[PDB]
Amino acid sequence: MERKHHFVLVHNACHGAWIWYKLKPLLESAGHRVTAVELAASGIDPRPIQAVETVDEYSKPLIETLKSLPENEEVILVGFSFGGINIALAADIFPAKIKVLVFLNAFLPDTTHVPSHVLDKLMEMFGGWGDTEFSSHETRNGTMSLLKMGPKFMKARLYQNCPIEDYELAKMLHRQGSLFTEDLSKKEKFSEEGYGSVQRVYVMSSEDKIIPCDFIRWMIDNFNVSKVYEIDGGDHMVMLSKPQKLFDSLSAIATDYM
Amino acid sequence: MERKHHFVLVHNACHGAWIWYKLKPLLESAGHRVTAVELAASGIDPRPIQAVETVDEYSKPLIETLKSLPENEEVILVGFSFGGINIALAADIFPAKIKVLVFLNAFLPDTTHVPSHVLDKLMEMFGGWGDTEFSSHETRNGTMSLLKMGPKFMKARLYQNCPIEDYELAKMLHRQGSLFTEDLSKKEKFSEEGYGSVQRVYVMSSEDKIIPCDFIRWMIDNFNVSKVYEIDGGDHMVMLSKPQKLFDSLSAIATDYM
Ligand SMILES: [Cl-]
Ligand SMILES: [Cl-]
C-alpha cells in the first residue's frame, strides 16, 4: 500500500470541527490520519467571538497543532471557506510543515494586496444575506464586525443540497462569528517566501451558492493554483452534502503528493 | 388527521441539543413541533460547567422554555438519561404544562427518597468508567463532582450501536459536565402534588450498557409508570443508533395522549 498522509482540516466561520464528522472516518478508514482543528470561539470552544479580537488569536489552535507536529512531519492542510485565510496564515509561519494547501470552497488570498482583499470583494458583490444578523463590537483597537447566520440564509445558500438532518444539526450548533475584515485590512501582506512558496490546489463545489464559480476564477486568476478539482452537485457545505466525492478529491490530491 | 403535539426534548449530561438532530426532522415531518432544549453549560451554551453550580441553574433553560409556552398549551416532555432528573424538576414547577413525561433510557426519581436516590444506586453498582476523567470543583455550595467522558468509554458504553459518523461527531462535541449528585442529595424530595401528579411513561433500549434493564425494572417497580416501551437493539444513545424506532415509540405515545 502507498504512503498515507496526515490531513489537518480547518473549518469555516460560525461553524466548528463538527462539520468534518462524515469526512474524518472516511479518511481514517483509508489509513490516513486526521486532525480536525477547532478554532477560537468556534464549536464548543468556551470563548465568545467578542473575546477573540484578531485573526491571529482566532487561528491560534491551528498554529498550535502545527507547532506540536514532530520534527520533519508534513501535512495536507485543508481550509474551508474563511479557513482559506486561516491556512494561508499558517503557511506563512510554517511553510515547510505543509506538503500542500487545499483550498476547499475557500477564500484564496494573494501576496500583492492587503489580506482582506478577496473577502472585501465578496462582501461588495454578495446580495443574499437574508436573515443573517450583522453587528459590531468595539475593541480597544477599533470596530470588529460580527455575523450570525440566519436559518433561512443557511438553508438557501449553504445547506441546500444537504440531508435535512444535517441542516438540523447546523441549526443546533452554529455560532456568531467574524470574518475579521477590519483586522485583516491592517495586517501585513502574506509573503511570497512563506505562503507563496507552498504548493496549493483548489477544490470547488459546482452548486456553491455563497462562493460562486465566477468569483473563484477571479481569485484564481488573481493568484494561481496547481490544480482545480470540481465536486459535482456539492453545495457550499460539501463535506456534508457530498462527503464521498470530497474524499475522492482528497484522495487524488494525496496521490499527486505521496 | 389526528392532532399533533409539541415535543420538548431534553438531552443527557455532557451532551447537548445536537443529539436530537436525527429525531427532530422525523417528528417535524409527521407534523409535530419540536423544541430541543440546550441546558446550561451544554452543547454551545457559552458557560463552562464550573459556572453552573446547582441542578436548578443547569435546568433553567428548560424551565424558561416551559414558562414561555402560551396559556393552556401542554407538551410531551422527553428526558434522556440525566434528562430524567431535569424533567422531574420541571414537572414539580409546571405540572399542568406537561401532557406526559417520557423517561428515555433515563433516571426516574421518586417522591419518597432524596432526589439523588436512583443515581446513588446506579453509581454504587456501576463499574468500568474506563478513560473517563473525574475532577472536583469547590463552590459556595460545597464540592461539585465533574466528569468528562473518555472516548474509549463512549465507544464501548454509550455509542456501541451507532454509526461511526455519530461517534466522531460526539467526540467533537461532548463536554465536561456534572450529574450534580451532591446538590441532588440535599435538595427537597420531589412532591406528589407536582411531579407525582403528571402522567409518565418509560422507553428503554434493549442494549443500553449504561442503564441496564434490571436497574430500570427496579426504578419502575419503585415508581410506577403508565406504560413501558422497548426499543430492540438500541444502545444508550438510542436517538443516534435507532432514530426511526424511537420515532415509532414517541408516535405511539402521542396516539395514547391525543
Ligand atoms: Cl466562512
Ligand atoms: Cl446523563
UniProtKB/Swiss-Prot annotation, chains A, B:
Pfam families recorded: Abhydrolase_1
Positions marked as site (Increases basicity of active site His): 208
Catalytic activity: (R)-mandelonitrile = benzaldehyde + hydrogen cyanide
EC number: 4.1.2.10
Keywords for this protein: Lyase
Source species, domain of life: Eukaryota
GO biological process, one term: response to wounding
GO molecular function terms noted in the UniProt entry: mandelonitrile lyase activity
UniProt entry tagged with the keyword Lyase: yes
Self-association state and partner proteins as the record states: Homodimer.
PANTHER family from the UniProt entry: ALPHA-HYDROXYNITRILE LYASE (PTHR10992:SF1013), METHYLESTERASE FAMILY MEMBER (PTHR10992)
Role, per record: Involved in cyanogenesis, the release of HCN from injured tissues. Displays R-selective hydroxynitrile lyase activity. Also accepts nitromethane (MeNO2) as a donor in a reaction with aromatic aldehydes to yield (R)-beta-nitro alcohols.
Assigned protein family: Belongs to the AB hydrolase superfamily. Hydroxynitrile lyase family.
Protein name, as recorded: Alpha-hydroxynitrile lyase
